[PDB]
Design a protein around this ligand. Structure first.
Ligand SMILES: Nc1nc2c(ncn2[C@H]2C[C@H](O)[C@@H](COP(=O)(O)NP(=O)(O)OP(=O)(O)O)O2)c(=O)[nH]1
Ligand SMILES: [K+]
Ligand SMILES: [Mg+2]
Ligand SMILES: [Mg+2]
Length: 329
DNA sequence: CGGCTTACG
DNA sequence: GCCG
DNA sequence: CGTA
């Protein structure tokens, strides 16, 4: 079992679901407390279990697995022996965890904002609604749409959304394309949002595209919130999606890249978040190359790698290719 | 011990 | 919290 | 700060 998540396939569904869930509770709780190193280790240990070919049934099967030391092994041991881990259950029922989870779910609220509200004594969404002076416009939109945004987006919703985005994109710039990215490209059947990557085959034609796309969608009445409702290339918006006899709010992320950068942008925005962190760490620490969603930089030659495909990028990094479905770290 | 992904809005 |  |  390799030490980096980008060195092994990780399928969406696997054989250690309960164990990985518990470790991810501890990871999440570590993040709420600002302990990013502990979050990383608990996330990595959970991901190792996702990559295993069969269920862990005995403690001895953790021998030699990377990212399993005293703490993560004790969590697994307790789950194997009793079906529950006391530390995990204490986190689950704690007021701090439940409130930080609730608050950071709000679009526009991160750990730092949630933690400040917690320290001020706020605990519920209605507590926030009674203090609208504390809220940015983004947070007001996240708070008002929170119920809809807590409802999973279905794969059957995604096709309808892509067609409406493609219509606006085609008027904004004929020839521009829309590619589904994020969790749905990795094979997920539901999601917290829908992620799209937009480009044009002629380099440079994509300059200035996203404002034109957003104004066309807003004219169609489809945009419940976006940050520009001057030049921008990413938009994190709330969209109006049809439902039977009604509509529901859905989060949609739109990103524009030049076609020269499209393989890097596709790789970055396809995720998973941990897969990409691991891939970028691998690139820098093991290969001495700097990876981001725009390119891959050799800091000694001071040169950028040209890539025509995701396959190119894996080859550059000396990694076996993983299709999106196996990037579910 | 230092390190822990890396951008744009 | 774990790795190198 | 937020988003990814
Ligand atoms: N490098 C990097 N990439 C990131 C980061 N955050 C997001 N991405 C990339 C990788 C992510 O795949 C992509 C957008 O994915 P999401 O919509 O944030 N989540 P997903 O679609 O997996 O699941 P669901 O939506 O159902 O919760 O942006 C980050 O901090 N760093
Ligand atoms: K949030
Ligand atoms: Mg997504
Ligand atoms: Mg997204």
């Amino acid at each position: 079992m390799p030490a980096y998540a980008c060195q092994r396939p990780t399928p969406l569904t696997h054989h250690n679901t309960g164990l990985s869930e518990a470790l991810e509770i501890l990871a999440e709780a570590a993040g709420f407390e600002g302990s990013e190193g502990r979050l990383l280790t608990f996330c990595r240990a959970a991901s190792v279990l996702k990559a295993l070919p069969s269920p862990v049934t005995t403690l001895s099967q953790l021998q030699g697995l990377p990212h399993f030391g005293e703490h993560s092994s004790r969590v697994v041991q307790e789950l194997l022996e009793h079906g529950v881990c006391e530390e995990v259950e204490r986190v689950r029922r704690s007021e701090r965890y439940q409130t930080m989870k609730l608050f950071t779910q709000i679009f526009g609220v991160g750990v730092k904002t949630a933690d400040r509200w917690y320290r001020e004594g706020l605990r519920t969404l209605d507590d926030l609604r009674e203090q609208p002076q504390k809220l940015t416009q983004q947070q007001k939109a996240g708070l008002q749409h929170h119920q809809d945004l807590s409802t999973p987006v279905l794969r059957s919703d995604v096709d309808a959304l892509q067609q409406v985005v493609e219509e606006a994109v085609g008027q904004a710039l004929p020839g521009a394309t829309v590619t589904l990215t994020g969790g749905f490209r990795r094979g997920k059947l539901q999601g917290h949002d829908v992620d799209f990557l937009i480009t044009h085959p002629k380099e440079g034609q994509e300059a200035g595209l996203l404002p034109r796309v957003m104004c066309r969608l807003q004219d169609q009445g489809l945009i419940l919130y976006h940050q520009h409702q001057d030049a921008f290339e990413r938009s994190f918006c709330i969209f109006r999606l049809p439902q039977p006899g009604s509509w529901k709010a859905v989060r949609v992320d739109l990103v524009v890249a030049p076609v020269s950068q499209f393989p890097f942008a596709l790789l970055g925005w396809t995720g998973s978040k941990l897969f990409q962190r691991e891939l970028r760490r691998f690139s820098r620490k093991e290969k001495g190359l700097w990876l981001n969603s725009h390119g891959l930089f050799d800091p000694e030659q001071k040169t950028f790698f040209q890539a025509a495909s995701e396959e190119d990028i894996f080859r550059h990094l000396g990694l076996e290719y993983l299709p999106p479905e196996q990037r579910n770290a």
